[PDB]
Amino acid sequence: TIQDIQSLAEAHGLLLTDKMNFNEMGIDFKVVFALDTKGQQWLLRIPRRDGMREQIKKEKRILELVKKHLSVEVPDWRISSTELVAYPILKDNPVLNLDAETYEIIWNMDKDSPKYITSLAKTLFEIHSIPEKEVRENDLKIMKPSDLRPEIANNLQLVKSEIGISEQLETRYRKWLDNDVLWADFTQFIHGDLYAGHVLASKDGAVSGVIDWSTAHIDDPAIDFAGHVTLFGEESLKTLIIEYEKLGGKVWNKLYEQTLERAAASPLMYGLFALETQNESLIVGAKAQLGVI
Ligand SMILES: [Ca+2]
Ligand SMILES: [Ca+2]
Ligand SMILES: [Mg+2]
């Protein structure tokens, strides 16, 4: 009940009024939009069933680490567990969200915004500069540069044998794995699931926050550029890379070309996720993205 949730928040230190609205669009969570007794708006997440324990533990450690090194806001998980996740509403809305009924992409920001490019580049620089020693201390996954390709090769085998893959996607992924010059000889801490729907910004485009941190680890930095090129296009990605390098972002000759292969590999990564988030709904939609059907 609303009273049940009020008790939990009280049982973890937070006093809420009895006025809540519920949202049902989530896969793993139900979402509650609450209000504390002083009038501040809150976001509650209640995982549906058992399963979410290690992700909620990990994401809380990631949030506490990244806020130390970011000049923009991330969710402040004052209550954190599979009983209840609660944080105050952040300052801005995402630059886009997906309409819940149709998945039509509704944009809260001008795509051409110069300020989005410069502030996203600065945020990318800040995320990718987080020291490996600190990532190690928080027990997060660390991919070495020489492990990247065998990892993907394993991913390709597993997704092929169970979900299936179009012949054209398989040949492109193998071409990718064969193209040595595309692969950086270093890895860095990355957000892991970064695109405009996970970036909060003012209407002028200035990044004010970044959300959904549960995938963050040390990996190929191009992963954090793929979501931009998919939505903003090749020319915008080039300007982003230039602003990034201007700030001291560590680049290599083929970062642009590697980012395009990463973006094209989206079907593979989603088929990988769908195999450990078991739904007929997900493997079917992953199947279509891979050129089957
Ligand atoms: Ca900070
Ligand atoms: Ca080769
Ligand atoms: Mg915090």
Side-chain angles (χ1 to χ4, degrees), residues 1-24 26-102 104-293:
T1 49
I2 286 188
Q3 174 72 267
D4 290 329
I5 311 201
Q6 272 177 299
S7 266
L8 277 182
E10 206 176 64
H12 285 104
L14 156 79
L15 280 49
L16 304 171
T17 75
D18 64 2
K19 253 54 154 53
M20 290 145 201
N21 321 120
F22 307 66
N23 190 270
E24 271 296 312
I27 306 189
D28 306 350
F29 303 84
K30 161 237 287 172
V31 175
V32 189
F33 301 102
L35 201 68
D36 74 12
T37 47
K38 326 286 324 207
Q40 188 174 10
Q41 262 176 324
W42 282 76
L43 206 158
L44 318 181
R45 284 185 191 320
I46 298 119
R48 278 225 294 147
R49 277 145 308 91
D50 300 31
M52 290 322 281
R53 172 169 91 131
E54 181 64 65
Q55 173 181 131
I56 301 324
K57 273 179 76 183
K58 193 160 46 78
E59 181 157 3
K60 168 77 184 163
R61 295 200 308 286
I62 290 165
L63 284 166
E64 293 299 326
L65 163 69
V66 292
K67 87 208 275 173
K68 303 209 255 178
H69 301 270
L70 263 50
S71 296
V72 300
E73 83 171 316
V74 300
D76 171 24
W77 281 15
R78 309 219 187 131
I79 309 316
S80 197
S81 93
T82 65
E83 303 191 357
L84 177 60
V85 176
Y87 55 95
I89 296 275
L90 284 72
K91 287 334 154 283
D92 285 307
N93 292 313
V95 349
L96 79 79
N97 34 74
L98 304 184
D99 172 320
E101 289 89 40
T102 61
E104 301 140 8
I105 287 178
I106 35 172
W107 281 85
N108 300 315
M109 164 201 102
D110 180 20
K111 271 188 31 148
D112 287 301
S113 150
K115 252 285 200 173
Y116 185 67
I117 300 295
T118 50
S119 63
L120 180 61
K122 179 119 199 155
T123 304
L124 283 170
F125 177 88
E126 285 181 335
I127 297 163
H128 298 165
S129 80
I130 293 187
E132 182 155 312
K133 197 175 164 83
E134 305 190 30
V135 178
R136 201 170 282 111
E137 280 166 5
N138 279 275
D139 188 43
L140 312 164
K141 183 206 244 293
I142 304 190
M143 275 329 270
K144 316 222 280 193
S146 59
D147 297 330
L148 294 186
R149 298 169 136 201
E151 164 101 320
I152 292 325
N154 284 322
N155 293 351
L156 187 57
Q157 194 175 138
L158 187 269
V159 168
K160 199 194 170 308
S161 100
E162 283 177 340
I163 285 173
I165 185 160
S166 99
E167 285 286 310
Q168 82 156 53
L169 273 187
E170 175 178 8
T171 72
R172 174 171 198 166
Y173 295 156
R174 298 193 182 281
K175 168 154 176 90
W176 182 27
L177 287 168
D178 198 15
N179 202 336
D180 291 46
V181 71
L182 257 50
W183 297 82
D185 59 19
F186 64 96
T187 55
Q188 289 174 318
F189 185 74
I190 57 154
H191 181 276
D193 188 21
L194 193 70
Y195 79 108
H198 286 162
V199 177
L200 324 174
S202 56
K203 302 324 152 202
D204 44 49
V207 176
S208 65
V210 183
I211 67 195
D212 286 338
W213 282 93
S214 97
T215 68
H217 64 291
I218 287 174
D219 208 327
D220 177 3
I223 293 164
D224 275 352
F225 291 81
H228 183 83
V229 66
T230 308
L231 273 310
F232 291 84
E234 274 166 12
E235 208 38 41
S236 174
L237 170 69
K238 281 181 233 211
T239 67
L240 183 50
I241 289 178
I242 285 154
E243 275 318 295
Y244 183 72
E245 182 176 18
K246 180 175 282 172
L247 307 173
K250 207 183 171 178
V251 297
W252 63 103
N253 281 358
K254 296 285 181 193
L255 165 64
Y256 167 85
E257 280 89 356
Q258 175 73 345
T259 305
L260 300 198
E261 293 318 305
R262 276 298 170 180
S266 200
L268 185 70
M269 302 309 153
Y270 180 66
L272 198 70
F273 209 57
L275 286 167
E276 284 125 22
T277 299
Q278 310 266 61
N279 307 71
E280 175 273 352
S281 211
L282 293 184
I283 306 132
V284 158
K287 209 176 268 275
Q289 282 192 351
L290 289 148
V292 168
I293 300 168

